[PDB]
């Protein structure tokens, strides 16, 4: 008997009930990752390749190796079933709409080919469908009802024991030679990416880095918009860190510092908010769209492709919004308050551009932008859905002025404006012609002009949205 | 081997292909001033077609929203839009 575990969104060896279940009594095992879009989306693929090399390095310690394969799963696995005589195929359960129809089609190919399919839940805390049935066959519309539901469920089981020396147990991985250059982990330059000007990784991918950051993150629990060395959101999305392990180590550490066996749901706010959008989208194949979405308000946005280009590329004329997009493009991550700032500038604040357009921009640059979380957030940031209570739009200039008056974050990612003082660093258009020449930066030549007047554009869109909700 | 065009190319992002960021647009472009009553009246017509495409909820889904959104409890406008 042979077996193959398909890796997709669980690039880790800890808490893997799908992988560990497949090696229980199989004679052969092989871990396979199927790797089948633009230029700026390089930090996304660099993160992924770092996780696969880390996943291969941890497999090398067990005298196994990772098998990276190009192509589509509907074409690759049918020939891997016969060339390897595969009997068992284990996968981590994917609740997303595209993932479910992809899994149901692959296992239909496997069941008719004599291959048994093993499915286990590891990317989420609970079984999302069990939460939907408690609500009445429909996922919760609000985060409030969602927290009421997760408290109405039996506690989670301990995460599956990590794959070690005995978990294998006389289970040979048939790593023949010629393995490299065929099943090896490609580089960024092998995918067609230009890495001549690429900087060092700010968010190093991999399972080892995730567990390292998790230990230091919990150690600092018992303002700044820069990247924190204890960030875990990209590793939760790519599956480098399991949410169930994050859950139990958050509980156990909370019981030690305190004496209360009833931790508030604010302790798992990062996981429950993450778990919420997975539940709200598993039964909604149009969750990433406005038209045809049962839980999205229809809004007549303006279609300005050139304005979307200025916003996405970080050339809007507002140093606050431009500094956020330059950090998003270069580092692949921005603060949550920064996400709220640039979303208002594009949706319900200034440009009046559809949230779907901003969803696809974050889809390529934001490292922790999962299909469920990234789609649901843009609906809430644009008041198009009702997941959480709304908030006032952020003025671009007068927002980060009190986070740091010098504009240290502005001069950080916008070196073209490094010669402006605090009275004009946030409003360079209101700067006199003399001070523009002494800084070697003229507005409209070296730095873009304000693509819109915030005073008129704000009151324009506020009245438009008043007309929308008063009509609803 | 005999694959004809083999030098693969990574194309630009979607927003750069659909649009055309002029090197002047990246500096000079500014959104035009709009007439308030004109843009509002045009949105009334487009909102008329987008009327039965609006989200329709059931009994439990409405009370589920009232515990979060006060404008669902009062019938007015949200606290963020009302400015």
Numbering used by the authors:
A (entry chain A): 3 to 38, 44 to 229, 242 to 491
B (entry chain B): 1125 to 1207
The publication says:
In addition to binding near the BMAL1 TAD-binding site at the CC helix of CRY1 and CRY2, the PER2 CBD also wraps around the distal side of the PHR domain to come into close contact with the serine loop. To see if binding of the PER2 CBD truly alters the serine loop and secondary pocket of CRY1, we determined a crystal structure of the CRY1 PHR:PER2 CBD complex that eliminated this artifact. The overall conformation of the PER2 CBD in our structure is highly similar to the previously solved structure (0.76 Å Cɑ RMSD over PER2 residues 1136–1207). However, we now see that the serine loop maintains most of its flexibility in the PER2-bound state. Comparing the secondary binding pocket of the apo CRY1 PHR domain structure to our CRY1 PHR:PER2 CBD structure, we observed that PER2 CBD induces a modest structuring at the C-terminal end of the loop (residues 44–47). This reorganization is stabilized by an interaction between S45 on CRY1 and the backbone of Q1135 on the PER2 CBD. To determine if addition of the PER2 CBD alters binding between the CRY1 PHR domain and CLOCK:BMAL1, we utilized BLI binding assays using preformed CRY:PER2 CBD complexes with the immobilized PAS domain core and found that the CRY1:PER2 CBD complex binds with a ~ 3 fold reduction in affinity. Therefore, PER2 modestly weakens interaction of the CRY1 PHR domain with the CLOCK:BMAL1 PAS core, suggesting that this modest ordering of the CRY1 serine loop makes docking of the CLOCK PAS-B into the secondary pocket less favorable. Therefore, the addition of PER2 CBD causes the serine loops of CRY1 and CRY2 to take on a largely similar conformation, with the loop in CRY1 becoming more structured and the loop in CRY2 becoming less structured. Our data suggest that the differential effect of the PER2 CBD on CRY PHR binding to CLOCK:BMAL1 allows it to serve as a molecular equalizer—PER2 compensates for poorer binding by CRY2 by modestly enhancing its affinity for the transcription factor, while at the same time reducing CRY1 binding to bring the overall affinities of the two cryptochromes for the PAS domain core of CLOCK:BMAL1 to similar levels.
The basic helix-loop-helix PER-ARNT-SIM (bHLH-PAS) domain-containing transcription factor CLOCK:BMAL1 forms the positive component of the core feedback loop. PER and CRY proteins interact with each other to form a large complex with the kinase CK1δ and enter the nucleus after a delay to bind directly to CLOCK:BMAL1 and inhibit its activity. What structural features of CRY1 and CRY2 might lead to differential functions in the circadian clock? Both cryptochromes are defined by a highly conserved photolyase homology region (PHR) domain and divergent C-terminal tails that are intrinsically disordered. However, repression also relies on the recruitment of CRY1 to the PAS domain core of CLOCK:BMAL1 via the CLOCK PAS-B domain, which docks into the evolutionarily conserved secondary pocket on the CRY1 PHR domain.
